[PDB]
Amino acid sequence: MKVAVLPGDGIGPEVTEAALKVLRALDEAEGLGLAYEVFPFGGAAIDAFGEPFPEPTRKGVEEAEAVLLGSVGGPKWDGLPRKIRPETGLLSLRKSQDLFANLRPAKVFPGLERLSPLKEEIARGVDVLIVRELTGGIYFGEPRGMSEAEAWNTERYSKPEVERVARVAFEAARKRRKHVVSVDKANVLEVGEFWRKTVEEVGRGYPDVALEHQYVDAMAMHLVRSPARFDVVVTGNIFGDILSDLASVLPGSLGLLPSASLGRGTPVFEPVHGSAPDIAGKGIANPTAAILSAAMMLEHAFGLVELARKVEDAVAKALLETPPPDLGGSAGTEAFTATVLRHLA
């Protein structure tokens, strides 16, 4: 299990250690054969190499089976030239690995329905995985341009692009509840038609997975009204953005949202929360996302689905017994991780 650990800035190092504590334990039990090395990345990397994504790291992730990222960025490095901005390190990582699918789970752990904006009958059971396309669509399609009279942008999609992301969606589904729902606007847009069409074809290869189609506007409604009825959701770029964020407000807290990016190269797992520099070092940083990103790494990168669950359950019960400050608690980073490890046994 070769893991490249890029802790990053702010609280990154704090929560990453917490995730590593859980992994080191699981290894001391199941005998996974872990083998990690931490690398400088983002702001940290900048202050030592003058670049957010140095070569020793670029090579380190190039030879690791998976990369566990912490946070990146901080008011200090935020105003530099785009070429060396800490955010640019992430783009360069993604690009170098051809990571085209971005996975974002939203789950209302049994017991924390209180935190959800939704009523408790509707939040109870939410566990949706939003798979989005990261490298195409209106966001990158040309032409694009402006004037004083008009502006324009082109949403373009090609077969290979839709097939790739469609496959990660069906594969992901295979490990979950076997239901996929492709989102598009086939009723009005050519690209919608093209998307629906290509997904269907790809769906043929996974006849054991329940496929469904939903227009983006009709889907925006269901996520609020009845999110619990969904498993995997797969959609194009910009719609992936809108649906991911709409899905993220369901659980009720940024600190319990892991994330992942799969593609041709080394997969990247990392929390969705920011660096939170002004709380960095004080301890008290919520490690739920990082630990859950690790859970995701086990499930996806190494396909140990069963262990990923064991971890999630442990952090599930952990959030109820010793809620970290964010959830109105005291359990700091170190204490909380401990309570996870207790249940992990």
Add this chain to the structure above:
Amino acid sequence: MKVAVLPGDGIGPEVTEAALKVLRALDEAEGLGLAYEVFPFGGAAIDAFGEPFPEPTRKGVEEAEAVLLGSVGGPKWDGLPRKIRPETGLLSLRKSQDLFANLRPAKVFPGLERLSPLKEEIARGVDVLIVRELTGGIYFGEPRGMSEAEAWNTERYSKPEVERVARVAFEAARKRRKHVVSVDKANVLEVGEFWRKTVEEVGRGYPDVALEHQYVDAMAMHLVRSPARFDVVVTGNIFGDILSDLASVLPGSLGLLPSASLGRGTPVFEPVHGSAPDIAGKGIANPTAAILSAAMMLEHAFGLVELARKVEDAVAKALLETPPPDLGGSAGTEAFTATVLRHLA
């Protein structure tokens, strides 16, 4: 005050009269000078002239200062060829009047928070009005096409298109809580920056209306997290399409949603609910959306903001006191209407 009443099909004429009953009542007390006429539309016009939007009607809307539409379409005409479909009548009526702005308000009536999918604390105070541009956007942008290997579509906007819709939003804000919120994807799309700068200018014409800009993805979260902080939300076609659908679930029931379509021609005010033939006749039809549509006509078509407010409140109280079947109640259409009419005095 000339109103062209196009009852429509299904419960169309049932809910519309209720509205008209209230408009007559208001006409007496407040000395309005109401002057309306009912013309055949949708299936009814097909049943009489052989087309959904026959010339006699088309003339009526042009002579009128506002149209009060009911519902349209049903099983009897669904099996008709496109050119004659009742749905096609709408497109004809909209196109003919140059209707470019679509106003869809969503509001959680005090006391009826239990229906919302949101928690009572969040869903309380919701009174958001979404203005969406209908004639531009990726929906009708060119170049747009599909092949065997790829599909493309052009999101395109011009100063004339963005300026005219923005104005309807500002004008709308003044009659409301004076705040306006434009939604775009300016951080990555050339059209979004263009939309933002253009709305920013139009905005300098209403120094009183508070203006804030928000990315479409961020807005999808805000409407769920805290919909009670928004007054008028203005945006483009597709984005407006999604946001309206989203905001619609907030109230809890489709029957309480009125809508309007302003433009260069005769404005159109109608309920979002379908024709519901399966209840057309046997009372029970909730006339709320219709009455609200009439109230919407007064504020927007005739500027009687005050008298509009009066109706909204009356109907509001009527919901608690005499809830219609579809709101767990028993009050029939006439029954309900009377209670509304009671509170109008």
